[PDB]
Structures are given as C-alpha cells and as structure tokens.
Amino acid sequence: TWPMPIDTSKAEGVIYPNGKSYSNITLTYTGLYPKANDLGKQYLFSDGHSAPGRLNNLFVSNYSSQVESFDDGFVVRIGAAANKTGTTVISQSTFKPIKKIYPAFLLGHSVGNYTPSNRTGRYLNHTLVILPDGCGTILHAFYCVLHPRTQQNCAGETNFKSLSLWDTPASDCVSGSYNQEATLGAFKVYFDLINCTFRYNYTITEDENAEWFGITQDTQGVHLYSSRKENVFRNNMFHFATLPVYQKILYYTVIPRSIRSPFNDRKAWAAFYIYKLHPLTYLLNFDVEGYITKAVDCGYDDLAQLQCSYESFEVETGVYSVSSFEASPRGEFIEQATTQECDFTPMLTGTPPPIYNFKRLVFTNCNYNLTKLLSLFQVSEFSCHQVSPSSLATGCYSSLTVDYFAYSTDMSSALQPGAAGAIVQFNYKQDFSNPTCRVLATVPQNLTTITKPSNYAYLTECYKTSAYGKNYLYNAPGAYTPCLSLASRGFSTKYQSHSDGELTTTGYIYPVTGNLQMAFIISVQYGTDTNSVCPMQALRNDTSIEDKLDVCVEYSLHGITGRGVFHNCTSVGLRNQRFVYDTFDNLVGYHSDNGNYYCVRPCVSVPVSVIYDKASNSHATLFGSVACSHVTTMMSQFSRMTKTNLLARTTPGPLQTTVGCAMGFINSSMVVDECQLPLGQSLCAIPPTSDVFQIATLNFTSPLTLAPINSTGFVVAVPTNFTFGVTQEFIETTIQKITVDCKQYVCNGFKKCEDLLKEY
Amino acid sequence: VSPSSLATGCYSSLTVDYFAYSTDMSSALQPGAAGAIVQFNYKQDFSNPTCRVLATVPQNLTTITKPSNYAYLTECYKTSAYGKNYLYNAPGAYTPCLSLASRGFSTKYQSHSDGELTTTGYIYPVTGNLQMAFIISVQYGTDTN
Amino acid sequence: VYDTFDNLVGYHSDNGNYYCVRPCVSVPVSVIYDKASNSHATLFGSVA
Amino acid sequence: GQFCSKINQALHGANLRQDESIANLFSSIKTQNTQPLQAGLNGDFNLTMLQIPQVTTGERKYRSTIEDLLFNKVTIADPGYMQGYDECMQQGPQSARDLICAQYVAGYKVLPPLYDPYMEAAYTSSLLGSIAGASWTAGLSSFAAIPFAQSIFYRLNGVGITQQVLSENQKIIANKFNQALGAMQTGFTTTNLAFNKVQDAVNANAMALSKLAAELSNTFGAISSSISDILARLDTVEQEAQIDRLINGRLTSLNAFVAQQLVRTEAAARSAQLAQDKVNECVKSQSKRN
Amino acid sequence: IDRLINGRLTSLNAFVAQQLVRTEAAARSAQLAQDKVNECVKSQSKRN
Numbered sequence A: 001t002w003p004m005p006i007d008t009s010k011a012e013g014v015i016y017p018n019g020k021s022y023s024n025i026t027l028t029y030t031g032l033y034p035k036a037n038d039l040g041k042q043y044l045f046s047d048g049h050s051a052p053g054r055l056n057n058l059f060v061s062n063y064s065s066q067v068e069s070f071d072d073g074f075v076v077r078i079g080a081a082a083n084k085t086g087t088t089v090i091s092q093s094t095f096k097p098i099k100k101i102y103p104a105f106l107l108g109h110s111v112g113n114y115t116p117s118n119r120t121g122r123y124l125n126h127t128l129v130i131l132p133d134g135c136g137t138i139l140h141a142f143y144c145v146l147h148p149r150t151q152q153n154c155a156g157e158t159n160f161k162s163l164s165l166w167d168t169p170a171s172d173c174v175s176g177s178y179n180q181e182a183t184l185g186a187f188k189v190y191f192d193l194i195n196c197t198f199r200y201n202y203t204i205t206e207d208e209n210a211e212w213f214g215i216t217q218d219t220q221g222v223h224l225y226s227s228r229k230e231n232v233f234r235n236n237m238f239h240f241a242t243l244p245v246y247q248k249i250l251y252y253t254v255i256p257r258s259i260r261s262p263f264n265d266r267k268a269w270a271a272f273y274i275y276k277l278h279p280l281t282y283l284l285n286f287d288v289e290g291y292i293t294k295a296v297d298c299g300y301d302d303l304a305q306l307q308c309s310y311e312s313f314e315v316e317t318g319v320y321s322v323s324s325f326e327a328s329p330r331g332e333f334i335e336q337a338t339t340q341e342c343d344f345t346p347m348l349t350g351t352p353p354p355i356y357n358f359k360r361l362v363f364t365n366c367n368y369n370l371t372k373l374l375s376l377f378q379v380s381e382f383s384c385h386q387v388s389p390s391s392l393a394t395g396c397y398s399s400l401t402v403d404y405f406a407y408s409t410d411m412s413s414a415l416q417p418g419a420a421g422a423i424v425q426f427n428y429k430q431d432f433s434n435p436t437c438r439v440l441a442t443v444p445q446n447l448t449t450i451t452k453p454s455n456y457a458y459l460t461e462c463y464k465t466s467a468y469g470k471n472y473l474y475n476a477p478g479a480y481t482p483c484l485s486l487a488s489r490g491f492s493t494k495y496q497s498h499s500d501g502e503l504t505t506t507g508y509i510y511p512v513t514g515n516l517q518m519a520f521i522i523s524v525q526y527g528t529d530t531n532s533v534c535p536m537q538a539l540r541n542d543t544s545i546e547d548k549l550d551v552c553v554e555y556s557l558h559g560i561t562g563r564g565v566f567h568n569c570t571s572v573g574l575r576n577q578r579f580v581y582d583t584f585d586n587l588v589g590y591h592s593d594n595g596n597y598y599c600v601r602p603c604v605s606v607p608v609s610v611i612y613d614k615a616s617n618s619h620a621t622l623f624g625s626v627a628c629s630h631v632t633t634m635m636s637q638f639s640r641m642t643k644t645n646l647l648a649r650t651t652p653g654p655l656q657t658t659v660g661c662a663m664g665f666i667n668s669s670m671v672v673d674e675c676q677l678p679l680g681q682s683l684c685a686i687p688p689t690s691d692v693f694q695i696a697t698l699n700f701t702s703p704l705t706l707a708p709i710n711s712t713g714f715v716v717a718v719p720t721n722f723t724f725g726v727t728q729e730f731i732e733t734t735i736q737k738i739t740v741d742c743k744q745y746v747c748n749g750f751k752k753c754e755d756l757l758k759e760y
Numbered sequence B: 001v002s003p004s005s006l007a008t009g010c011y012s013s014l015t016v017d018y019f020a021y022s023t024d025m026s027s028a029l030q031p032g033a034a035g036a037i038v039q040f041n042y043k044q045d046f047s048n049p050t051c052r053v054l055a056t057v058p059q060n061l062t063t064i065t066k067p068s069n070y071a072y073l074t075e076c077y078k079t080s081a082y083g084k085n086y087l088y089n090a091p092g093a094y095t096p097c098l099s100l101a102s103r104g105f106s107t108k109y110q111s112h113s114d115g116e117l118t119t120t121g122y123i124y125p126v127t128g129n130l131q132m133a134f135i136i137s138v139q140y141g142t143d144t145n
Numbered sequence C: 001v002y003d004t005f006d007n008l009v010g011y012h013s014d015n016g017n018y019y020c021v022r023p024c025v026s027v028p029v030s031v032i033y034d035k036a037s038n039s040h041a042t043l044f045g046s047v048a
Numbered sequence D: 001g002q003f004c005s006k007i008n009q010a011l012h013g014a015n016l017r018q019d020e021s022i023a024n025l026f027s028s029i030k031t032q033n034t035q036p037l038q039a040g041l042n043g044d045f046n047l048t049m050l051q052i053p054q055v056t057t058g059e060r061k062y063r064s065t066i067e068d069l070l071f072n073k074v075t076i077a078d079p080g081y082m083q084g085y086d087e088c089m090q091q092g093p094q095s096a097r098d099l100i101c102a103q104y105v106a107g108y109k110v111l112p113p114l115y116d117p118y119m120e121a122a123y124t125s126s127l128l129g130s131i132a133g134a135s136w137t138a139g140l141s142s143f144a145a146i147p148f149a150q151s152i153f154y155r156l157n158g159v160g161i162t163q164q165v166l167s168e169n170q171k172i173i174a175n176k177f178n179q180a181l182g183a184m185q186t187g188f189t190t191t192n193l194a195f196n197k198v199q200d201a202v203n204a205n206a207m208a209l210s211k212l213a214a215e216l217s218n219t220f221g222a223i224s225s226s227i228s229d230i231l232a233r234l235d236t237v238e239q240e241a242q243i244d245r246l247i248n249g250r251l252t253s254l255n256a257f258v259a260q261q262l263v264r265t266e267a268a269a270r271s272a273q274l275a276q277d278k279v280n281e282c283v284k285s286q287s288k289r290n
Numbered sequence E: 001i002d003r004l005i006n007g008r009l010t011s012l013n014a015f016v017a018q019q020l021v022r023t024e025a026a027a028r029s030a031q032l033a034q035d036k037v038n039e040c041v042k043s044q045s046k047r048n
C-alpha cells in the first residue's frame, strides 16, 4: 500500500481544454476533473511462477471479476515509481529496480456470467478492448464480440479461473525484434473475435519516466488522452484519438497481467492508479510556454472558494466574503391535491360546429390526461406561444380553455397571426394575451363517435348599412361574431346572404371530401395561490418533507415550483394559509398538508467569510449572524472540507462571537492597539505562529491625565528633549489621457454594422 | 447556421444522423414537440449549430432499398412498486430499450420485456417513395478547422 | 498566435514565414488645426 | 466576461478604505492629553448634559444624556449581527425589518462597523476634557492643565471683553451659559434642519438596499421572474432567449448599485476629513473666522 | 450584430463616465497641492 493522492498544485490529472492554447492567464472552467486529494484505486501486477529452466502458471489477483462503473471517464497514473528499488511482488524479499507497465482495459454496455464456470465478469455484446503490445511500443483498439472458446481453461469452461495475460520477454522483447502481436495472440487464445467493426493502432516510444492516460465518452465517440502527447515531460493530457463507439458505455474492467520473465531476471513493475472524473469547476493557470502549471478545485475548502470567487491565486491578507461552488445533490418535494377527471367527452361525440359558431370548454378543479385526447387524432400542426407542446401535458394551471371547430387544413395559413382574409375578420381571431396553442388535426376513420357534416362553411361579410356604403363589424380577440344570430338560419348555397335589416351577413360553403379535419385552440393560465387544474399522476410515498428537512430540495407544491431549504417553524395563522410571501414576492413560508408550518429559504442562504493570512498561509471561517446550533444542522450548503469538520465535531470547535459563529478560532484575553484582520465590533484576528487563530480586542490607550493642583498657579508639562519627525503624503495631480476611436471600436470597419449604428 | 453557409464553412467535426421517417409526421421532430418521438426515439441536441433535413428518395436512385414498415417505439419503462417508471431520451443519445428493440416488431403494439425493462413498438407500411430524415451538426473551433 | 484578449496578433504561414497581423485601421492619426489661418497638419503618433 | 469577480473586488476595496478613514479619525485618542473633569458642576458651569452618567452595578453606560435623547428620535433598523439569521425565522414577515431579513433571500450582507459603541464613547469623552495648552502661547507641544471654568473666561477675554466686566458678571455669564445647554434638548424636531440630515442619512442607507431586493421580482419582459419556471415551460432554444432577459436586467442593477457605493464612499471619506478640521479648530481651539 | 452593438455601446459609456469622474477628482486635488505648497513649503503652518 502506497497512497498517491491528487495534487492540484502540479495540475495532476488535468486534461487540457480543446481548441487553442493560452499563456499568462488564470481562468475558471467547468468540466470533467478529479477531486482534490483523492486517493484513487491502486492496481498492482507482478511476475508469474518461474523455475530455473521452466515457466509455470500465472500469478494474478481477483481483478477479472471486478466490474466497476464507468459513468464519466477516468484518468490513470502510470509509472510513478520508475528507477527506484522495490519488491518483485511474487517474492517480496527480492529487491529490484521497478519498471513501467501499461494497463489493458475491457469496456462494455452489458455484463453477465461465465457459464459453466458460473463466475462473474463476462461482457456479452460488442465490447471495446484496449491492449498494449510490442513491449510497450504499440497500442491496439478494437470493438468486437467476444466468444469464449472451448479448450482447456479457455473461458468457455467448467475449469476456467480468470482472464490473465502474459508476455515472454526473453522471446518477445529481444532487442530490435519486438513481436507487436504477442499480447493480441494471447488474447486470441482466450476468445474468438466476431464481427469487428474497427481496429486501430498507435505507436508509442519505450521510455520510463511517468505518464498519464485518460478516457472519456460523449456523442462524438470515445476520446483517449495521453500525457505523452506534445511533450512527455509534463502532466497535461492531450487528445490523440477518437473511437466510433456511440452507445453509452456503462462498465469497465482492468485485465490482470502477469509477465512470464525468466526466474533469474525477475523484474518489478510499478503499480498504476485509477481516479474517477467528476463534473467540477476548476481554476487553471497557464504559464508562458502554454502548459497548465497549477489548478484549484473550487469546492474543496474555503481558501479554494476564496481563490475561485475572486479569480486569482495570490490573495493579499484580509477578510473576504465568498460564494458557494458545491454541488449538493437535491431531492424532491411534490404535493398536489386530488380531484376528479376533466371530461373531454363533448369533443369526441357528435358533429363539430362551424368556425363562426365554435364550441368552448373551460375546466377548473380537475385532473386532465392530454395524452388520451391527442392519441385519437392525427396531428399535422402544433404551434404554441409562451409554452411548449411538451410542457402543456405536465403543468398545473388555474384554468384550461379549449375552443374547437371543424376546419380544413388546406386553409391553414388563414389562422396564422396577423393573417389577411375573412377568417380572422368575421369568424375567429385568436387571443395572444395568455399562453396558447393551436392544433390542427385529422379525425381517422376508426373513431366512429365523431360524425361528419356535409359542408365546411365560413362567413365572408358582417356589416351594418350606413349613409355611405357598408360599415364592417370586425371580430374581437376570443369573441364570437356579432352576426351570430343571423347566421343560425343556415346557408344552403355559396354567397347566400341573410339580413335582419340592421345587419347583413354572407356565407360560403363547400363539401367535405375525405376524412374530417378539426381545429383546437388551447389556452392556459398560471396563477399563484393553488393552481387547481393538475395532470393525472401515479402515487409515490417518497416525495415528502418529514425526512429530508434541512437539505436543498426541488419542490412542486400545488403548482408552485422552485428549489429551496425547508425548516421547522412555528408561525403564521390567517387564511391565505398555503403560501406566505415577502414584500418582494419571495416564498418565505409554507403551510403543509399534515399540520406543520415550514420556513422556506433559498438553496444558498447562510453568509460565509474567510479570514486569510498570507505570511503564514492560514485561513479560518466565519458564519456571520448565525447561531452555532444551526450550523451543524445545515451542513450541506458548505464546502467539502467544512462538512467533514462539522460532522466530525473534533477540532477547536465552533465558537459563538458577537458577529456570528467562528470556525478555526480560540478565545484569548489579549488586547491589541492596531489591527490587520478586523472582524467587526472591536474584534481582531491574531494569525497563528499558536497553531490556530485567536480573537483579541481593540482598546486604545490614552496618555495619563494631568490633574489640577490646588494652589494659585497651574501645572504645565513643558518639553525637555525632542526629535524631528517626518510625515509623508502623496497628492495626485493628473491622470492618464486617453482618446478612443469609437467607429473602429464598435463596428471594426464593417459597413453592415455602421448602418445599424445610425439607429442609436 | 444557414443552409447556404453549411456548404461553404470549415469545421472541426461534422456529424450526420440519419434514419427513415415519413414526412407526414414532420411536426413530431420539432423542438419541444409532444408525442412519443422525442420521448423514446430521438431528441435533437441544440448545443451546437445544427440542421434538420427531410427528404424523399426518388425512384431513379436504385441503390437505396426500401423497408416494408415504418416503425417507432411508444414505450420504454421499468416496473416499480407503483405503476411504471418511464425512461426518457437524452439529447443526442440512443434509447435505453435498444437491445430489447432488436428482436423486431411483427405487429402493432407488440411488447418485449427483459424483466427489468419493457418496450412497445408501432409499425405501419411504406406506401409510395421512401422518405428519410437527416440531422447534421457542425462544430467551429480555433486551431485549424 | 493570440493576445491576452484573443486577437489574432500573428500567423505562421505555409511557406516558411512569420507575419504580424494588425487590424485594417491601426495607426493613430491626429490633426493640428488653426482657425485664424485655417491651416492644418498631421501627426502619426508612436510611429517611426 | 468575468463579471462577478469584478463586482466582488470593487466592493471589497470600497469597504477597505472605509476602515482606513474611521481609524484615522479615531487615532487622536492615543496622542491626546486630557484632564479629569468633575461630575456635574465645574465652577458654575453645568456639564451634566454632556457627561456619561456613572453607575454602581457594572453596566457601564456608553451614552451621555444628550446622546440618549438624540438616538431615541431616529428610526434605525437593528441589523442583528450576532444571531440575526434565526431572529428572521421566529417572527414572520414584519414589514419594517424586511430589508434586514432580505439579506438571506436576495443574497447580500450588512457588515458590522469597525468599532463597537464603547470605542466611540471613548472618542467623545477625550474630546470633552482635552488639555490643549495655554491660549497665549505658540506651538502645540505644551499642555497646561487649567480648569474648564477658567478657560472659558479666557475665550471670552479673547473676543474683546475686558477683565473688569468678566469679574463683575461671573454669575450672570454662568447662568446664560447654563440655560443654553438646557435648550439643546428641545431642538430634536422636524423643524430643525440640522437634525433632519441625521434621518436623511438613515433613509439614504435603507433606500439603497431596497433597490437591490426589488430588482429580483421584475420580469424584464420575460414570461416569469423565476428561472425554475422558464426551465419548466419552454424548450432549450426558447429558454436561452428568456434567461438572457433576466441576466441583462440583473446585471444592470448590480452595476448601478456598485457605481453608487463608490460615490457614497468617496463623499463620506471627504466628509470625515472635514470632521477632523472642525474638531481641531472649533472643539480644541477657538475660531477667528466667521 | 445588434447584440455586439448594444454590448459595446455600454462599455464606452461606462468608460467615458468614469474618465470625467477621475478628471474632476484630479482637478480638485491639484488645487489642494497649491494650498499645501503655499502654506507648508513656502511658509510655516500654525494649524494642527
């Protein structure tokens, strides 16, 4: 055992960002990075059993039955103990110079059992295999189906133990005559390679210093990264290969090796280390040559939060207020009310009405299933406004309105916003003040409850007679036409007018050929105070608040959504009960279904300051305005190191000062005059040389009081000695004068930009 | 990006997804659409510049054979203690019920199950010429596109 | 070759040569103007 | 850009030069020679309005009689420096301490001052009994401990009242001085225009904080003022156009807040330099300028 | 292009609005350097 944690001050395990190279900067990045001071997992290989004149069975570990999960990618540290002395692990009493050994991987999407060995670790479909070969000079990557053979212990067996590879370097690694298919041959003895889709090779140079190797996956395939790329002497990993594997890799497996060296030439091989990648924020510093020199994991402790919150590595002793960069995975708090189903039955039975006499349904206080409705039609258009069609079937509203009528979808351009003809003028004008959607559907023939009419019909005119011609009466948004009572007499032919004296209307009919087509206009309304039209749900216990109290949850309470922290309070009465708001409309409180009241806070609420001293490079933490009993309950907003020190309860503990709770501090009884790290309220921080910070007090002295004597004269203090003192002072008299070329600054000499700038 | 600039630019990578698809169901591939195409079959990824072409294969082009039935999945879930637990697609990713779907669907609403997962297919015959869908995605970078 | 503000400040050509890249309007120009005689002259600042 | 790193650095540097201005004004305590006064009547001059009332039990008052009368005429919200996070949970939304409890829902913090009220009660007690050596001498290097009653009569002799008038009218001058300190505590009203500037600074401090919390309930033309509702109703290409409205509306409020804090910090730094000139000339000496 | 224009008109306004503040503050402070020369350097001060 030999712990090798991740050191971010050397930028260990950091993959260089794609694109160009930087120099002389420090910037923040979100990506796949290892944790700070993460130990990883150590994998140790060795040499197999050997005799004078004989090569015996292999010596391996239980590595070919371990199935780890891939989940983001990983990085591997290879050869950190080259040129040193160490044990030849098969015989720990033998000391030899340690060598470098590359790992071999098996990565796949499905796993099973090796029958009839009935052990575990069998990949059964197309599987990605990564093999080093040629005494560490070549790298094969291929993607095949592995069929276990039928020989003595060749993996289709009742006597197969574990997959294990080997080399005979007295034959294979003869200088100049490296067999670059040896390990591939030993692999082919175990398996048959069926239906290989690709096979790639990469050439390495045999040298033993130290290197890194990484592998990730996204929608462009599987990416391989190496530290040997573009300079072997650094820690940065650069991209060198993309493999066309587009299905999601779930599992991987390290293949155990055992080098069959001769017994006289037993070597030592350096263990390698695997570290998992996480979606983290990092601070990266690029040197003059372009290489990342140091990094900061911005969620590890509070000095790292300071460095990433002010975006610099040198921080200039002080007391700073910082931001939060921790992940803190959330839960769920869903709570809606139970009601009846909304009835869409007067939409699926009967004859759909004409456009000027459309039908309207308004639903409140019910459960809807929009999937059941839309499954009966053939949609050819779904156009929405301030909502999406996918979110329409999942939201909770205060009301839900459906207008519907019969309409032929070859006239689909007449229902568009701001359209030209007589559909928007005399029949139907859509209202765009709410979120809304417009569906155009065809009624298929199996749906037999919807009868069809004989003629599509629409109005072409609606006017009053005037002293000069006609006075047209246009539709309002969402309203019926004023000529509706005049239109109920029916139109038997095209351009058949009707008149009540004051008004006149004209209709146009044309026959229905084919299936019937219909139009639906849906409009919803989001409100506060208990949106009651909610979708149908299956029931689940786990979405409650009784368990997950002081953690950040994602809630959905009677139509109100958000993220936050819920705390046990004892409070508000009056009968708006469910949601209590602030004067700036923040959800400050909630009346739960059982009987309880809860205070709602945002997911990052507690203020945090860090006291930093550069000369000793020390730091401590202050939670301002918080009592020290709430800090140990809400220990999930904070950084990764603050959580463990809170949870351990083993340090100089949390301390209650007059400005909040303090971590890393100690009560003192000393009194200072000047202060470099002031906390507020005449408190000063004393940095350690002691081993922790101390808290002192600011008391100014006063020169001793000269008291009047009782006599005729008075006392006067007159000098008997002196010096000359020099006071320095800077007075600024000027600034740097700057003129800006405004045209070249804004538009860079482009004529298309310069014509858009005239509008300002 | 525009369709005209797509044939003149220099990129660092170029990805084409393609499949057979009838263009009377063209409103189901739209952004934020409602049904089972974006939920269980294909969800387009809008983090890169991208284009969506819907085309018909003419009859003179004879190297493209046609299938017998258009097909799509309508369900992919795990059994739970209360009903079903639906498994929705990620943008740009395959469905998790892909190994279960390789057995083929001979009729409409024919389910398959591996115990843990369950899937359902819908087929309908190809009448006329074959129609296809292409999703093209490009990536502009610095350092030598 | 880029700047610290991501400007293309330089380029390594295909033949063998290095080139400095400047924007299309780069040299500063000032004009000295005298109204009583209606005369003017030019100064290209910081340029040899 | 790197927007939030530059907002953090501007406000950190503004709060740093706020501490170097208070510490300069208070650094005259360590160099000032002082004489002890009597509790209540120094000669015939009643100074009880300006002195801290002494006590038997160890409560140790930090406020004089006229200062306790001025502080109970101003309405300041108590900021809760010690455990103000939990006091906002025991009470509900009382809308008079609402921009004090909005620190934990909007995302700002009110920092405690550099000195407690016991330090600034030591600054004005050293201003009352300063020695300030005799007023016929040149230099600032001798300290003559003459009593308070005798050094007032040397300030009346310096403006042109002879010693034969000052000796015949001691009691009348002392009475007229005493009934001018008894009239200071009837001038804390809204007609007094010098007292209305004490409240207009309290109001200016609070108006800045309410223009921060009120810009989080604006929608700026988006569908909602909440990001978790934009992410639940729209799709990925329409979310980015609506979140970019909230971002643009909230970057403007932070720029307008940070640009006003620097203006008020420079104006308060120039005005604490005027308070040093007014102490060294009016309080510790006698002015010859009208 | 109307986004780049709006983003670059804001930076120029914020630059020009800060230059006038610093110019007035440096003009008031060069008037203080005349009072400090005429009193401390060329004479002797009677004020503390």
Ligand SMILES: *[C@@H]1O[C@H](CO)[C@@H](O[C@@H]2O[C@H](CO)[C@@H](O[C@@H]3O[C@H](CO)[C@@H](O)[C@H](O)[C@H]3NC(C)=O)[C@H](O)[C@H]2NC(C)=O)[C@H](O)[C@H]1NC(C)=O
Binding pocket: A658, A681, A682, A683, A697, A698, A699, D058, D059, D060, D116, D118, D119
């Ligand atoms: C040196 O300076 C110190 C700070 O200026 C002085 O210490 C202060 O003494 C006060 C009382 O004398 C304390 O007031 C107490 O504050 C708490 C706050 O939580 C109240 O509950 C108490 O009621 C209140 N005490 C009384 C009697 O009302 C201050 O807290 C305390 N300051 C600190 C930082 O502890 C020293 O007195 C001073 N010493 C000398 C010799 O000058």
Ligand SMILES: *[C@@H]1O[C@H](CO)[C@@H](O[C@@H]2O[C@H](CO)[C@@H](O)[C@H](O)[C@H]2NC(C)=O)[C@H](O)[C@H]1NC(C)=O
Binding pocket: A124, A125, A126, B099, B102, B103
């Ligand atoms: C992955 O390999 C498995 C073998 O375990 C294949 O599963 C077979 O699928 C066919 C088709 O339904 C079944 O008839 C067989 O019974 C399955 N095998 C076993 C052992 O049960 C599977 O087809 C492969 N994946 C793909 C995509 O083809």
Ligand SMILES: *[C@@H]1O[C@H](CO)[C@@H](O[C@@H]2O[C@H](CO)[C@@H](O)[C@H](O)[C@H]2NC(C)=O)[C@H](O)[C@H]1NC(C)=O
Binding pocket: A138, A180, A181, A199, A200, A201
């Ligand atoms: C590694 O793969 C490469 C490419 O797939 C192989 O290179 C080619 O191999 C074929 C097959 O013998 C030859 O006909 C070509 O001439 C090779 N290309 C070149 C440029 O030489 C390579 O042989 C493979 N190496 C190993 C050890 O398998």
Ligand SMILES: *[C@@H]1O[C@H](CO)[C@@H](O[C@@H]2O[C@H](CO)[C@@H](O)[C@H](O)[C@H]2NC(C)=O)[C@H](O)[C@H]1NC(C)=O
Binding pocket: A369, A371, A372, A375, A536, A537, A538
């Ligand atoms: C919404 O309605 C659909 C009907 O279109 C429901 O789906 C049915 O559910 C039952 C109960 O499990 C099944 O037996 C049917 O086979 C389903 N029908 C189809 C066509 O799949 C669905 O359950 C409803 N949604 C909710 C949340 O209740």
Ligand SMILES: *[C@@H]1O[C@H](CO)[C@@H](O[C@@H]2O[C@H](CO)[C@@H](O)[C@H](O)[C@H]2NC(C)=O)[C@H](O)[C@H]1NC(C)=O
Binding pocket: A704, A705, A706, A707
């Ligand atoms: C001038 O008088 C003061 C008295 O007010 C002296 O201060 C005293 O000094 C002695 C010796 O250092 C101490 O023991 C006393 O406690 C001091 N008393 C006070 C009230 O401070 C001062 O030292 C005298 N000056 C000289 C030069 O002797």
Ligand SMILES: *[C@@H]1O[C@H](CO)[C@@H](O[C@@H]2O[C@H](CO)[C@@H](O)[C@H](O)[C@H]2NC(C)=O)[C@H](O)[C@H]1NC(C)=O
Binding pocket: A720, A721, A722
């Ligand atoms: C005034 O003070 C200074 C410094 O405290 C005295 O100078 C010291 O004089 C002695 C004897 O001449 C030397 O041994 C020291 O080295 C001197 N110190 C320094 C810093 O120069 C001076 O003597 C004092 N004057 C009086 C009259 O007491």
Ligand SMILES: *[C@@H]1O[C@H](CO)[C@@H](O[C@@H]2O[C@H](CO)[C@@H](O)[C@H](O)[C@H]2NC(C)=O)[C@H](O)[C@H]1NC(C)=O
Binding pocket: D041, D046, D047, D048, D049, D065, D182
């Ligand atoms: C000196 O002034 C103080 C305050 O102005 C006087 O104290 C007040 O005296 C009156 C009348 O005796 C009482 O009613 C008040 O309660 C006192 N107030 C306080 C705060 O003490 C004091 O009497 C004056 N001294 C003399 C000698 O007149």
Ligand SMILES: CCCCCCCCCCCCCCCC(=O)O
Binding pocket: A350, A351, A352, A353, A354, A355, A406, A407, A408, A411, A453, A454, A455, A456, A457, A458
């Ligand atoms: C039982 C009530 C039936 C009422 C009468 C039903 C007649 C409906 C037919 C008219 C359809 C309107 C067509 C809109 C114009 C269009 O074609 O674009």
Ligand SMILES: CCCCCCCCCCCCCCCC(=O)O
Binding pocket: B020, B021, B022, B025, B067, B068, B069, B070, B071, B072
């Ligand atoms: C040689 C490989 C052939 C693989 C099988 C080909 C079958 C393709 C037919 C399915 C088309 C999918 C249709 C999508 C649904 C649509 O109609 O909208």
Ligand SMILES: *[C@@H]1O[C@H](CO)[C@@H](O)[C@H](O)[C@H]1NC(C)=O
Binding pocket: A062, A063, A065, A066
């Ligand atoms: C060795 O591997 C087996 C199979 O995975 C596992 O059960 C066992 O725990 C491993 N040994 C140790 C010490 O973990």
Ligand SMILES: *[C@@H]1O[C@H](CO)[C@@H](O)[C@H](O)[C@H]1NC(C)=O
Binding pocket: A116, A117, A118, A158
């Ligand atoms: C495991 O495999 C063996 C064959 O080696 C077989 O006899 C046994 O039945 C298997 N176990 C089960 C539970 O089927």
Ligand SMILES: *[C@@H]1O[C@H](CO)[C@@H](O)[C@H](O)[C@H]1NC(C)=O
Binding pocket: A145, A194, A195
């Ligand atoms: C290999 O490919 C052939 C097609 O040529 C296919 O029939 C066979 O099933 C594949 N092998 C396996 C194990 O799937």
Ligand SMILES: *[C@@H]1O[C@H](CO)[C@@H](O)[C@H](O)[C@H]1NC(C)=O
Binding pocket: A079, A080, A081, A082, A083, A208, A209, A210
């Ligand atoms: C091992 O030795 C070689 C050459 O002697 C050197 O280049 C390499 O850095 C060394 N590795 C270590 C880990 O010291």
Ligand SMILES: *[C@@H]1O[C@H](CO)[C@@H](O)[C@H](O)[C@H]1NC(C)=O
Binding pocket: A444, A445, A446
């Ligand atoms: C309508 O129902 C009948 C029932 O026998 C069926 O044969 C027919 O295919 C159905 N129509 C369509 C378009 O599916």
Ligand SMILES: *[C@@H]1O[C@H](CO)[C@@H](O)[C@H](O)[C@H]1NC(C)=O
Binding pocket: A541
């Ligand atoms: C969930 O609730 C049901 C209803 O009471 C109960 O039968 C079941 O045991 C619960 N399950 C869990 C995990 O709490």
Ligand SMILES: *[C@@H]1O[C@H](CO)[C@@H](O)[C@H](O)[C@H]1NC(C)=O
Binding pocket: A549, A567, A568, A596, A633
């Ligand atoms: C109130 O919340 C606390 C957590 O701080 C919890 O321990 C307690 O059980 C809760 N009380 C009730 C009545 O739910």
